[PDB]
Scaffold this active site. Structure first.
Site, mmCIF file in Angstrom:
data_model
loop_
_atom_site.group_PDB
_atom_site.id
_atom_site.type_symbol
_atom_site.label_atom_id
_atom_site.label_comp_id
_atom_site.label_asym_id
_atom_site.label_seq_id
_atom_site.Cartn_x
_atom_site.Cartn_y
_atom_site.Cartn_z
ATOM 1 C CB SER A 200 -36.358 -64.337 -55.789
ATOM 2 O OG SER A 200 -36.290 -64.379 -57.212
ATOM 3 C CD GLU A 325 -31.031 -58.604 -57.434
ATOM 4 O OE1 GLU A 325 -31.203 -59.791 -57.762
ATOM 5 O OE2 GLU A 325 -31.318 -58.186 -56.290
ATOM 6 C CG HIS A 438 -31.661 -63.383 -57.902
ATOM 7 N ND1 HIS A 438 -32.401 -62.239 -57.674
ATOM 8 C CD2 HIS A 438 -32.533 -64.416 -57.823
ATOM 9 C CE1 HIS A 438 -33.659 -62.567 -57.450
ATOM 10 N NE2 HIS A 438 -33.766 -63.881 -57.538
#
Ligand SMILES: Nc1ccc2c(c1)c(-c1ccccc1)[n+](CCCCCCc1cn(CCNc3c4c(nc5ccccc35)CCCC4)nn1)c1cc(N)ccc21
Ligand SMILES: Nc1ccc2c(c1)c(-c1ccccc1)[n+](CCCCCCc1cn(CCNc3c4c(nc5ccccc35)CCCC4)nn1)c1cc(N)ccc21
Lengths: 533, 537
Positions: A200, A325, A438
């Site tokens: 990230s 995601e 994610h």
């Protein structure tokens, strides 16, 4: 006193602790200062190198987590708590941790430096998912992670000022990188073989180091997991940062830049964190208030400009995304979504949810998104509407920026490897509809399924082993392929012609072409032209 | 009268006719070819609404096709069957308003369902006398009464100074309506049922059928409709009043006619037919394919509003339509203007030739819209592959002009109470002379619907013969009952209605009917829902 646990670094002696990993012992040195605590008058300023210390510094323990917002959306729930600080909050947080094999490596060992994510507003190098013991024990890696300042403390910028120049959280990382150069040999690291990796915001940070010349002499290879310096969320312009910083000041009673910054420095930490969200220009998800700024200094132009024009011939990069995601972001603002139910949404909820996922979109651009993501055979089907909302967020924020970078780096001479991670942890506490969210590959890379007490399946422990090999092989060689495994299939490089990438899951490597090429054409080529006019 | 075949003498409102016993594979059929239905629209009548044919004395000879209406004759490929088969096969004359009737022989003892054909040809060409429109097979094999008309094309049919007395526009559609009124009054003399009349047409013929559906005075003259590869909505089938004024005026100027409408029309009138044809194409606002100079005009009269608005608000409860498309609607248009394309080579184009082809295929697109088209049609795995680029060009043109306009006709009519049946026609004639890359081109199902493969001397395959019989059964079952399905036939797979909820349609090929869902649903949402909005802002 165990001679293996005593190290002399440039600023004094350290004492580490022997930790138990399932296959044997590891040496851990936790909480090593690498900078003067950025407190008081040093708030918002670039870090300064840590002064020398006397005697033996106790490095057996994780040190404070940088002051940050603590998630409260689902209190007690493991899926959120696992990301929350697991040590005391403090502005005094510039510390790094090193794991090595036990005994210390005989010859120089490749070094892997981890940079955590957390939207540039959160994260800590002490979380259970970033535990370096497994990679050190199994693959004989020297593993390093640093804390770095987040939210206002890392990224509040009044661009052009001396006392809040922006990007200080990235400079924290850079200092840790120099610390590694100077000191890692003492631990049996090979400073000539450093690989950054991050997820990230950590991935975006890695990307920014790629794109900033002073950082480039501090590593050889990079791994960007589910994030990129390019894209809608990872940077802001000078103008936008000045605005946000100014607005934050106004919200906390402050008050030229000097006067403004001095009064910000008199404010309790939690006062800054309290009002941190109120500076976003629009209702949104996957947007963060204080993130790296395009300052003409750390970042000489936009990541987009820098990737279109850079020379990347010397570079090896591993990039990838997870299967879902955007799914986990939906519950943080999109009406109709919760982890506690299947989140079947209406069409109205879908258009509405899009203006929040694409906050910058005009009516036309949003309409364009809706039209391209609707299933025209069942336009009203609530499960597709839900899955599509998730894919809008994922594609816009992670997948297409990644494809763009893979890009791009490949076209400008970098060696690039790409993946999509498709295994969903059997231990996952988010509901099934979120798929593989994610952040949920990290436990596999760090090797957590090797801890028999966490009861992952056997299949998952094999899978974790394979992953640790790809990553460390890549660290070792700039090629994730096992250089003695003569039974297939090989992970080929990502090129602009073939656009080859691999799926990491329980089955053997499958080679695929085009990283949602059709969908990313829309996001990378058409959307920008459409917002322009 | 009495030495000739007593079964070929019929009377109509205008007088006595003598027709001809024709031979079809299965046996004889009666034909009445060249029946005048209007006063010749010559001289002072050029550009005027047709006037009903005045009665004649004596027996009119109705044994041969009559003149084709004045029109452009294709020359791009001389001697080539692929173009010649659409070229006029009788002499060109402004005196051309005649129709044709095929019936069983002897004529049916009880009132028979009537099929009325309207030919296509972009509103600038066409003829009811072409081999591929031969009624003998449907007449013989299905017991059908088939009627087909000439209607005026190009300027003579469609040149308009909207609002004027002397050139109101849409007169070619009025020719077609006059033939429909002729069928109402006279078809019973041939043993046809005027209360069971189905229109059918391909290309401009289909758009015409559509205009009749949308024009009230026409709605009482027929009773269902079949639109093959054409719609009244879409980018080519109509023009605004403004644009028709502009084209009339420009053409007037190009033939040396100079300032009110009466002088301008009088001078056009005046001009030799060939001179009008020679300058017809010069009035098109941009470089283009699939655009035609003189087409139906939105006059606020025949068409009371745009076809788009009329299908959004019309009530269609009483209506039964069969509509569909062929696999490769656009391919054969590419050789008529897109650089890189030819019938004589594989047409493997470059990426530049594709972006250039898009501006021609979508003449009305801004830069933004064209970019959207390219982005949506590029394959981003192989963006420079010349085969894909060729096929995408074809699809762009086919999707934008036919497939997606059909896709809403179907959707709007179904949302509004019509019984709709939808097909994609996918069989490439074994006898086709266009190249393989063109696939199944615009127009190439007609042959099969009319039962040409039943003529043994044509060299079609045996499976093609069975195939044509099926299609003929579907079409006449539909004419007969509003349902292409065989009532008796329990076994053979069923053709469900097209609905908005299920978007069902069938493949028509050599294999039995396969039911598919969504007519390029994803792509047509681009052309019908997004592109227009992009074209505003
Ligand atoms: N009423 C308020 C007032 C202030 C703030 C509010 C709300 C919120 C908020 C809470 C619930 C719903 C909407 C908004 N927030 C939170 C918005 C942040 C949303 C991002 C959460 C998220 C979700 N994911 C995906 C799933 N996995 C992860 C996470 C989290 N962190 C990580 C870190 C690295 C990799 C993965 C990962 C944390 C949360 C849950 C899942 N990543 N990040 C605040 C934040 C601030 N910095 C300051 C103030 C406030
Ligand atoms: N230099 C000139 C001067 C005058 C005209 C010219 C060119 C052209 C032209 C010719 C070649 C290339 C570009 C332009 N044109 C353009 C005619 C070409 C456009 C239509 C071609 C076409 C292609 N298809 C698809 C294949 N099937 C058919 C056809 C044709 N007709 C039909 C009719 C019904 C069903 C099918 C069908 C005719 C030709 C070939 C195939 N349909 N129609 C003119 C037209 C006029 N009315 C008057 C003057 C001129």
């Amino acid at each position: 006193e165990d001679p293996q646990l005593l190290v002399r670094v440039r600023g004094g002696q350290l004492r580490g602790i022997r930790l138990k990993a399932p296959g044997g012992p590891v040496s851990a040195f936790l909480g090593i200062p690498f900078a003067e605590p950025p407190v008081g008058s040093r708030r918002f300023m670039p870090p300064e190198p840590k002064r020398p210390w006397s005697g033996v510094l106790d490095a057996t323990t994780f040190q404070n987590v940088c002051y940050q917002y603590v998630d409260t959306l689902y209190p007690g729930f493991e899926g959120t708590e696992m990301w929350n600080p697991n040590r005391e909050l403090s502005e005094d947080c510039l510390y790094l941790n090193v794991w090595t094999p036990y005994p210390r490596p005989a010859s120089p060992t490749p070094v892997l430096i981890w940079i955590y994510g957390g939207g540039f507003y959160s994260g800590a190098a002490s979380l259970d998912v970033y535990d370096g013991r497994f990679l050190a024990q199994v693959e004989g890696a020297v593993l390093v992670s640093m804390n770095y300042r987040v939210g206002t403390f890392g990224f509040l910028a009044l661009p052009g000022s001396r006392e809040a120049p922006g990007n200080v959280g990235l400079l924290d990382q850079r200092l840790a990188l120099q610390w590694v150069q100077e000191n890692i040999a003492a631990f049996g690291g090979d400073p000539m073989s450093v690989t950054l990796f991050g997820e990230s915001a950590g991935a975006a940070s890695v990307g920014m180091h790629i794109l900033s010349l002073p950082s480039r002499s501090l590593f050889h290879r990079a791994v960007l997991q589910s994030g990129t310096p390019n894209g809608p969320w990872a940077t802001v312009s000078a103008g936008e940062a000045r605005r946000r910083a100014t607005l934050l000041a106004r919200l906390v009673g402050c008050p030229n830049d000097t006067e403004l910054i001095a009064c910000l420095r008199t404010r309790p930490a939690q006062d800054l964190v309290d009002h941190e969200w109120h500076v976003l220009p629009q209702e949104s998800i996957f947007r963060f208030s204080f993130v790296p700024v395009v300052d003409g200094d750390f970042l000489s132009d936009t990541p987009e400009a820098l990737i279109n024009t850079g020379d990347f011939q010397d570079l090896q990069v591993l990039v990838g995304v997870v299967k879902d995601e955007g799914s986990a972001f939906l519950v943080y603002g999109v009406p109709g979504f919760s982890k506690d139910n299947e989140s079947l949404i209406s069409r109205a909820q879908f258009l509405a949810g899009v203006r929040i996922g694409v906050p910058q979109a005009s009516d036309l651009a949003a309409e364009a998104v809706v039209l391209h993501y609707t299933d025209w055979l069942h336009p009203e089907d609530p499960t597709h509407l839900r899955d599509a909302m998730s894919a809008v967020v994922g594609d816009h924020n992670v997948v297409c920026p990644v494809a763009q970078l893979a890009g791009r780096l490949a076209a400008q001479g970098a060696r690039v490897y790409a993946y999509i991670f498709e295994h969903r942890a059997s231990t996952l506490t988010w509901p099934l509809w979120m798929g593989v969210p994610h952040g949920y590959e990290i436990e596999f890379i760090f090797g957590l399924p090797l801890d028999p007490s966490l009861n992952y399946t056997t299949e998952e422990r094999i899978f974790a082993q394979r992953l640790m090999k790809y990553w460390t092989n890549f660290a070792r060689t700039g090629d994730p392929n096992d250089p003695r495994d003569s039974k297939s299939p090989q992970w080929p490089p990502y090129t602009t012609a073939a656009q080859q990438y691999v799926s990491l899951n329980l089955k053997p490597l499958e080679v695929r072409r085009g990283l949602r090429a059709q969908t990313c054409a829309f996001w990378n080529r058409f959307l920008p032209k459409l917002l322009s006019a």
